[PDB]
Amino acid sequence: MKRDSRIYFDITDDVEMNTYNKSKMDKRRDLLKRGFLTLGAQITQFFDTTVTIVITRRSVENIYLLKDTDILSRAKKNYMKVWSYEKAARFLKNLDVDLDH
């Protein structure tokens, strides 16, 4: 049987951008956060072993190059789901969630 959905938003980046784009990414984040709250996900402040999903802006295909203490390493070690913002926004759409609204 399944367990409560607990989502951690990775706060670390592996990309550079200007201030404008940061704000735009932060909006995307909050907007996504708001969507998952709606479906009833729990949105945890800290990362730990009870997270079921990490939503990250960083490079998933390159996790193998990360330190062992990096939350993305740990998430993969722990068979958690790691999603990009795109895949996440897909998840919400396909589940009939008004993103625009």
From Swiss-Prot:
Heterodimer with CDC7 to form the DBF4-dependent kinase (DDK) complex. Interacts (via PBD-binding motif) with CDC5 (via POLO box domains). Interacts (via N-terminus) with ORC2, ORC3 and RAD53. Binds to ARS1 origin DNA. This is DDK kinase regulatory subunit DBF4. Regulatory subunit of the CDC7-DBF4 kinase, also called DBF4-dependent kinase (DDK), which is involved in cell cycle regulation of premitotic and premeiotic chromosome replication and in chromosome segregation. DDK plays an essential role in initiating DNA replication at replication origins by phosphorylating the MCM2 and MCM4 subunits of the MCM2-7 helicase complex. DBF4 recruits the catalytic subunit CDC7 to MCM2 and to origins of replication. DDK also has postreplicative functions in meiosis. The chain holds residues 120 to 220 of 704 of the full protein. Induction: Cell cycle-regulated. Protein levels increase as cells begin S phase and remain high through late mitosis. It comes from Saccharomyces cerevisiae (strain ATCC 204508 / S288c). Phosphorylated by CDC7 and by CDC5.
